[PDB]
Amino acid sequence: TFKTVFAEHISDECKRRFYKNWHKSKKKAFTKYCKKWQDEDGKKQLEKDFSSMKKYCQVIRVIAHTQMRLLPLRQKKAHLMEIQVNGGTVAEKLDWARERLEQQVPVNQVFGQDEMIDVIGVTKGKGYKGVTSRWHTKKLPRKTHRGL
Amino acid sequence: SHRKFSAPRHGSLGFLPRKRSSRHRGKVKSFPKDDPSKPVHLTAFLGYKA
Amino acid sequence: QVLVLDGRGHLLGRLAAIVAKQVLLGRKVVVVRCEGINISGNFYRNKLKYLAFLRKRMNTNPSRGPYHFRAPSRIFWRTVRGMLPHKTKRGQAALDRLKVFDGIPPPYDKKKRMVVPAALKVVRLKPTRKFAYLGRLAHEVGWKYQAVTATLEEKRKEKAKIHYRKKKQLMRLRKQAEKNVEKKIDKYTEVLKTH
Amino acid sequence: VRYSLDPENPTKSCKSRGSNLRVHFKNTRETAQAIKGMHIRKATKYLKDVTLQKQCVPFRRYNGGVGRCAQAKQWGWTQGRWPKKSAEFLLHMLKNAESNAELKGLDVDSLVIEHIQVNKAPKMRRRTYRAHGRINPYMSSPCHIEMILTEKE
Amino acid sequence: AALRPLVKPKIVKKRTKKFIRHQSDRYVKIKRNWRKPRGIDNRVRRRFKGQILMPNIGYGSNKKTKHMLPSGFRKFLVHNVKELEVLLMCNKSYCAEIAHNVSSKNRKAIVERAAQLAIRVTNPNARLR
Amino acid sequence: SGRLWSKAIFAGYKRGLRNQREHTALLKIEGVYARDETEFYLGKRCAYVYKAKNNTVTPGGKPNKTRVIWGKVTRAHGNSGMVRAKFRSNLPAKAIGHRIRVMLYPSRI
RNA sequence: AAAUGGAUGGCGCUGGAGCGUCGGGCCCAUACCCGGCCGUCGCCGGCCUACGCCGCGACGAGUAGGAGGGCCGCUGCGGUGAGCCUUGAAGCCUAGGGCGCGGGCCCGGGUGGAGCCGCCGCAGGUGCAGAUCUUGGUGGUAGUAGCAAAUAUUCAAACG
RNA sequence: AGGCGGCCGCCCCCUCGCCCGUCACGCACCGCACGUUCGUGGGGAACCUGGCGCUAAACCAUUCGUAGACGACCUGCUUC
Ligand SMILES: [Mg+2]
Ligand SMILES: [Mg+2]
Ligand SMILES: [Mg+2]
Ligand SMILES: [Mg+2]
Ligand SMILES: [Mg+2]
Ligand SMILES: [Mg+2]
Ligand SMILES: [Mg+2]
Ligand SMILES: [Mg+2]
Ligand SMILES: [Mg+2]
Ligand SMILES: [Mg+2]
Ligand SMILES: [Mg+2]
Ligand SMILES: [Mg+2]
Ligand SMILES: [Mg+2]
Ligand SMILES: [Mg+2]
Ligand SMILES: [Mg+2]
Ligand SMILES: [Mg+2]
Ligand SMILES: [Mg+2]
Ligand SMILES: [Mg+2]
Ligand SMILES: [Mg+2]
Ligand SMILES: [Mg+2]
Ligand SMILES: [Mg+2]
Ligand SMILES: [Mg+2]
Ligand SMILES: [Mg+2]
Ligand SMILES: [Mg+2]
Ligand SMILES: [Mg+2]
């Protein structure tokens, strides 16, 4: 990881992701970072970071999150994901990313119908179960002492 | 020895470290490769099983 | 203090012998360009021996037991481990003194690389005998990092070409100054007292 | 009577002891190691939290087969247990030490517990009734408790 | 600077370890006094390398430097005044050593008689008020 | 100002394959790499400089933290230019791969 | 062609660190030579504890076993030290000082409160690491197994 | 696996920033070691002083089930 540049308008769902106890937290994240984005003299030390990003990096990933306000869930924390842009050259990938900072990405934009797209997730936890349920081995008959 | 009824083995050696994952959001191990011929797009989105 | 060794055109066993002898004396030696270390014999023979070494593993638990590195720097470091008394607190300190690097790091770009004469392929091997590249062996088996290391190596070779023209220009300027006048009075004394 | 680790002076220090009292030596040692190095009001609140099962006692040495708890992360330890009876007896002896400091005339609000000590009292033997008509001993493990408290300056 | 006795050379002992007994470290029922093992399998009796060393005649000190204190005298134990006065002839090589069961009331008289007769005593300042 | 002693690295004790003899130690001295070259250094005097936290030094001016076990060159050792040395006290065995000073006195210039 | 993954010891070794013939050096064992010290033995010296004191020379390993010495030790007995002490004996502890190669011993510091020791002879129920040793006590296990055969308890008040 | 180097406009001084020659001095500590070093060497707790800034986060508790033997993991808690 060379350097990470975060946007200015960071949502409260992302702040709930960064904190653990949102009740006990004083909501103090990214105050100086947004002050650096707001200051004009800090932009001259910030636009050089993208010029170094154009020169040295090849893999650029885009951290995005979900809107928990549209969901019927109770979690209210937004999950962050790095999304590797597999487009053209690093210069226009950076231009595309800075053009679409602080913006929504619909699924109908990138993904389409009749497409073969794999799903990655975490299985249903069944708990601390035994051998004939986990490994699906053959059971022992009724006559067996000390375990079937 | 000479087990006399050879059976296919239960389970898989490739999925053997059956530890709980430290993360619950399933991360991406590998993204597809890139090229300047293809236009600029994203690869991975989030979702919730309804 | 510190020693920086080339790996181009060196043999694995000879270089490991000289490094493992000079690291027990305290000289902090570092072997750079480890992917360029040659190994005598046929390359199919060397990868057959290394495939047998990979076959050597514990049946009860492969993690708790034989670790098998694929990077050539760690191959050379295992070669020096098998020669130093690493189970005692002399060879462990010697391995802590030893550092190994694939490619060339940026401080070792600047710091000058030594070439050991007695470990050279040209000195030790007849040129009509076969050989094998440790970097080629590592790229064939496991070490997937030749496309990055070779690219950065060509980049620093271009940096070396853009430095050598400036150094040779400065050497031409100082020899023009030596060709110029009013230095010979000390030069008579220097020639009569061992120029 | 004599105490191990005699204090700097008997003027600014009080002392207390319990002898031949039916507890477990391991539980009282593991709660005394948590009491030691603590202000007296913090220790009183700590033992009331032990009796209310709100703050635990980590088992650091005598930790054989002891289940875990979530409350042990304040101590940097994984296991824990809540000794009710040991907390009751050691709170009674802390009240005894408070009364002795009141008799000696110290600044009763600023005592700290510098020294605490626990060692095995002579145990009393009972018997079980196991298989095949055999008799195995069923013995207690009481302890002697010593504590030396000191003003904090 | 008390008496400074006659010519006594450099005292060597050829080893100063007061040889430990085998497996006295492992069991605390065994006192650390030497006792010759007579087993048929013991590495100490078989004299393997890397083991303890048995006391034999080779560790005997020199007869000139035998029973020699580091001060340069030879110690002799004393109970009373007459057994102190027997050392009147050879006080320049033989020093006195008052017994442990001698009280202070007689110990001060013994050390006073030793100071008068110029006889070295090893413990002059013990058990005093 | 300037260093007067020649550099020499402690290598180990006089030993066989199995056992050791700690009364005589081995020094890989720099510059010498030959049997004919380890002739001038016969009779030199060595010194191992180490540190301790108690205040025990030479009477040369100021009290410091430096302790030194003295010794001198006995004879040569092998064909590679290694030099035997017997010190006044035996080596602490911590000096392996560390430096022992060799000063240019009683030799015969 | 053989079953665990492994063996010129491994690492590696090819103008050798392989093979056969050899040259000059280099390294060490308790082997050899010189020297210091102890002991045993042989020969011997002196009218200085004669059972002591010196001198020369050669050698010292060892289970079963056999001798000699012990100013090694424990218990008691008779002589013996005008012995030791309630101004502190025996016993015990001790990062103290020391001796003897060793059995062990003497002194320093602390608890203790009434008997103890050196030499010469005498007599032993006289020295412990073991014997699935006897008696007594105490650890790891371990705050572990276990407080589960016979359907089941609950609210309020009272003495406390 | 980056922190030192190069260029320009100025800065308070230095034309002994070095070699060759003359002159007079500074401890000459009277025969003695561990001396001169990259050292304003590395880490920890405090002491008095100037300027520029910072005003939190974990763990327990409670709740939660997408999670659980116990731990552990994902969660909620604003006065609208
Ligand atoms: Mg479940
Ligand atoms: Mg059955
Ligand atoms: Mg991956
Ligand atoms: Mg356990
Ligand atoms: Mg448990
Ligand atoms: Mg029962
Ligand atoms: Mg019965
Ligand atoms: Mg045998
Ligand atoms: Mg091999
Ligand atoms: Mg050959
Ligand atoms: Mg014999
Ligand atoms: Mg009495
Ligand atoms: Mg006696
Ligand atoms: Mg008997
Ligand atoms: Mg009897
Ligand atoms: Mg016994
Ligand atoms: Mg026996
Ligand atoms: Mg038994
Ligand atoms: Mg028993
Ligand atoms: Mg009894
Ligand atoms: Mg028991
Ligand atoms: Mg239980
Ligand atoms: Mg029942
Ligand atoms: Mg009531
Ligand atoms: Mg009532």
PDB file of N, CA, C and O in Angstrom, chain C residues 130-156:
ATOM      1  N   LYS C 130      27.933 -27.806 -17.705  1.00  0.00           N
ATOM      2  CA  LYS C 130      26.617 -27.197 -17.605  1.00  0.00           C
ATOM      3  C   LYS C 130      26.462 -26.438 -16.289  1.00  0.00           C
ATOM      4  O   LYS C 130      27.220 -26.625 -15.334  1.00  0.00           O
ATOM      5  N   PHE C 131      25.455 -25.567 -16.255  1.00  0.00           N
ATOM      6  CA  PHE C 131      25.206 -24.702 -15.112  1.00  0.00           C
ATOM      7  C   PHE C 131      23.712 -24.414 -15.043  1.00  0.00           C
ATOM      8  O   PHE C 131      22.948 -24.770 -15.944  1.00  0.00           O
ATOM      9  N   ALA C 132      23.298 -23.765 -13.958  1.00  0.00           N
ATOM     10  CA  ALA C 132      21.897 -23.415 -13.779  1.00  0.00           C
ATOM     11  C   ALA C 132      21.796 -22.132 -12.971  1.00  0.00           C
ATOM     12  O   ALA C 132      22.589 -21.882 -12.060  1.00  0.00           O
ATOM     13  N   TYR C 133      20.799 -21.322 -13.313  1.00  0.00           N
ATOM     14  CA  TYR C 133      20.530 -20.068 -12.622  1.00  0.00           C
ATOM     15  C   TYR C 133      19.585 -20.324 -11.457  1.00  0.00           C
ATOM     16  O   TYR C 133      18.546 -20.974 -11.624  1.00  0.00           O
ATOM     17  N   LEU C 134      19.946 -19.807 -10.279  1.00  0.00           N
ATOM     18  CA  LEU C 134      19.082 -19.951  -9.114  1.00  0.00           C
ATOM     19  C   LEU C 134      17.806 -19.138  -9.267  1.00  0.00           C
ATOM     20  O   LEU C 134      16.745 -19.562  -8.799  1.00  0.00           O
ATOM     21  N   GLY C 135      17.877 -17.995  -9.953  1.00  0.00           N
ATOM     22  CA  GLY C 135      16.670 -17.238 -10.238  1.00  0.00           C
ATOM     23  C   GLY C 135      15.747 -17.937 -11.216  1.00  0.00           C
ATOM     24  O   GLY C 135      14.524 -17.884 -11.064  1.00  0.00           O
ATOM     25  N   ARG C 136      16.317 -18.617 -12.216  1.00  0.00           N
ATOM     26  CA  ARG C 136      15.514 -19.408 -13.145  1.00  0.00           C
ATOM     27  C   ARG C 136      14.874 -20.597 -12.440  1.00  0.00           C
ATOM     28  O   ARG C 136      13.700 -20.908 -12.678  1.00  0.00           O
ATOM     29  N   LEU C 137      15.635 -21.255 -11.558  1.00  0.00           N
ATOM     30  CA  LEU C 137      15.101 -22.336 -10.733  1.00  0.00           C
ATOM     31  C   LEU C 137      13.974 -21.852  -9.829  1.00  0.00           C
ATOM     32  O   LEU C 137      12.947 -22.528  -9.684  1.00  0.00           O
ATOM     33  N   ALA C 138      14.134 -20.668  -9.240  1.00  0.00           N
ATOM     34  CA  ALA C 138      13.119 -20.144  -8.336  1.00  0.00           C
ATOM     35  C   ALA C 138      11.870 -19.710  -9.092  1.00  0.00           C
ATOM     36  O   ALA C 138      10.751 -19.902  -8.607  1.00  0.00           O
ATOM     37  N   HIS C 139      12.035 -19.134 -10.287  1.00  0.00           N
ATOM     38  CA  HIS C 139      10.869 -18.789 -11.093  1.00  0.00           C
ATOM     39  C   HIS C 139      10.147 -20.028 -11.595  1.00  0.00           C
ATOM     40  O   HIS C 139       8.917 -20.017 -11.721  1.00  0.00           O
ATOM     41  N   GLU C 140      10.886 -21.102 -11.875  1.00  0.00           N
ATOM     42  CA  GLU C 140      10.232 -22.334 -12.287  1.00  0.00           C
ATOM     43  C   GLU C 140       9.498 -22.994 -11.127  1.00  0.00           C
ATOM     44  O   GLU C 140       8.403 -23.535 -11.317  1.00  0.00           O
ATOM     45  N   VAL C 141      10.056 -22.942  -9.924  1.00  0.00           N
ATOM     46  CA  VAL C 141       9.462 -23.610  -8.768  1.00  0.00           C
ATOM     47  C   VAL C 141       9.146 -22.541  -7.726  1.00  0.00           C
ATOM     48  O   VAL C 141      10.008 -22.119  -6.950  1.00  0.00           O
ATOM     49  N   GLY C 142       7.892 -22.088  -7.702  1.00  0.00           N
ATOM     50  CA  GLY C 142       7.354 -21.359  -6.572  1.00  0.00           C
ATOM     51  C   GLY C 142       7.491 -19.852  -6.592  1.00  0.00           C
ATOM     52  O   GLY C 142       6.471 -19.160  -6.484  1.00  0.00           O
ATOM     53  N   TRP C 143       8.706 -19.317  -6.707  1.00  0.00           N
ATOM     54  CA  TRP C 143       8.961 -17.882  -6.555  1.00  0.00           C
ATOM     55  C   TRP C 143       8.432 -17.164  -7.791  1.00  0.00           C
ATOM     56  O   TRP C 143       9.062 -17.172  -8.850  1.00  0.00           O
ATOM     57  N   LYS C 144       7.269 -16.533  -7.641  1.00  0.00           N
ATOM     58  CA  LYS C 144       6.520 -15.939  -8.739  1.00  0.00           C
ATOM     59  C   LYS C 144       6.904 -14.488  -9.010  1.00  0.00           C
ATOM     60  O   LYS C 144       6.133 -13.758  -9.644  1.00  0.00           O
ATOM     61  N   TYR C 145       8.079 -14.059  -8.569  1.00  0.00           N
ATOM     62  CA  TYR C 145       8.437 -12.649  -8.527  1.00  0.00           C
ATOM     63  C   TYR C 145       9.608 -12.329  -9.445  1.00  0.00           C
ATOM     64  O   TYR C 145      10.519 -11.591  -9.071  1.00  0.00           O
ATOM     65  N   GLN C 146       9.608 -12.872 -10.660  1.00  0.00           N
ATOM     66  CA  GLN C 146      10.631 -12.471 -11.616  1.00  0.00           C
ATOM     67  C   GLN C 146      10.197 -11.265 -12.439  1.00  0.00           C
ATOM     68  O   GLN C 146      11.044 -10.453 -12.829  1.00  0.00           O
ATOM     69  N   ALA C 147       8.891 -11.107 -12.672  1.00  0.00           N
ATOM     70  CA  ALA C 147       8.401 -10.008 -13.499  1.00  0.00           C
ATOM     71  C   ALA C 147       8.554  -8.658 -12.810  1.00  0.00           C
ATOM     72  O   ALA C 147       8.665  -7.629 -13.485  1.00  0.00           O
ATOM     73  N   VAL C 148       8.563  -8.636 -11.481  1.00  0.00           N
ATOM     74  CA  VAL C 148       8.797  -7.403 -10.739  1.00  0.00           C
ATOM     75  C   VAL C 148      10.287  -7.146 -10.560  1.00  0.00           C
ATOM     76  O   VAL C 148      10.769  -6.026 -10.771  1.00  0.00           O
ATOM     77  N   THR C 149      11.026  -8.198 -10.193  1.00  0.00           N
ATOM     78  CA  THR C 149      12.442  -8.060  -9.872  1.00  0.00           C
ATOM     79  C   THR C 149      13.266  -7.739 -11.113  1.00  0.00           C
ATOM     80  O   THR C 149      14.159  -6.888 -11.061  1.00  0.00           O
ATOM     81  N   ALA C 150      12.957  -8.377 -12.245  1.00  0.00           N
ATOM     82  CA  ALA C 150      13.679  -8.094 -13.482  1.00  0.00           C
ATOM     83  C   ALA C 150      13.366  -6.697 -14.005  1.00  0.00           C
ATOM     84  O   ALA C 150      14.245  -6.027 -14.559  1.00  0.00           O
ATOM     85  N   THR C 151      12.128  -6.233 -13.812  1.00  0.00           N
ATOM     86  CA  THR C 151      11.754  -4.885 -14.233  1.00  0.00           C
ATOM     87  C   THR C 151      12.480  -3.830 -13.406  1.00  0.00           C
ATOM     88  O   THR C 151      13.051  -2.878 -13.955  1.00  0.00           O
ATOM     89  N   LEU C 152      12.496  -4.006 -12.080  1.00  0.00           N
ATOM     90  CA  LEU C 152      13.233  -3.082 -11.223  1.00  0.00           C
ATOM     91  C   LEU C 152      14.739  -3.182 -11.444  1.00  0.00           C
ATOM     92  O   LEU C 152      15.454  -2.181 -11.304  1.00  0.00           O
ATOM     93  N   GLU C 153      15.227  -4.362 -11.836  1.00  0.00           N
ATOM     94  CA  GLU C 153      16.644  -4.521 -12.137  1.00  0.00           C
ATOM     95  C   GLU C 153      17.023  -3.786 -13.415  1.00  0.00           C
ATOM     96  O   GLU C 153      18.074  -3.140 -13.470  1.00  0.00           O
ATOM     97  N   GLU C 154      16.176  -3.855 -14.447  1.00  0.00           N
ATOM     98  CA  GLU C 154      16.434  -3.081 -15.658  1.00  0.00           C
ATOM     99  C   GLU C 154      16.305  -1.585 -15.404  1.00  0.00           C
ATOM    100  O   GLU C 154      17.035  -0.789 -16.013  1.00  0.00           O
ATOM    101  N   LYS C 155      15.420  -1.194 -14.481  1.00  0.00           N
ATOM    102  CA  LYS C 155      15.299   0.212 -14.105  1.00  0.00           C
ATOM    103  C   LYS C 155      16.570   0.714 -13.425  1.00  0.00           C
ATOM    104  O   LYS C 155      17.081   1.793 -13.757  1.00  0.00           O
ATOM    105  N   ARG C 156      17.114  -0.061 -12.481  1.00  0.00           N
ATOM    106  CA  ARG C 156      18.340   0.391 -11.832  1.00  0.00           C
ATOM    107  C   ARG C 156      19.555   0.253 -12.740  1.00  0.00           C
ATOM    108  O   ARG C 156      20.529   0.986 -12.555  1.00  0.00           O
TER     109      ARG C 156
END
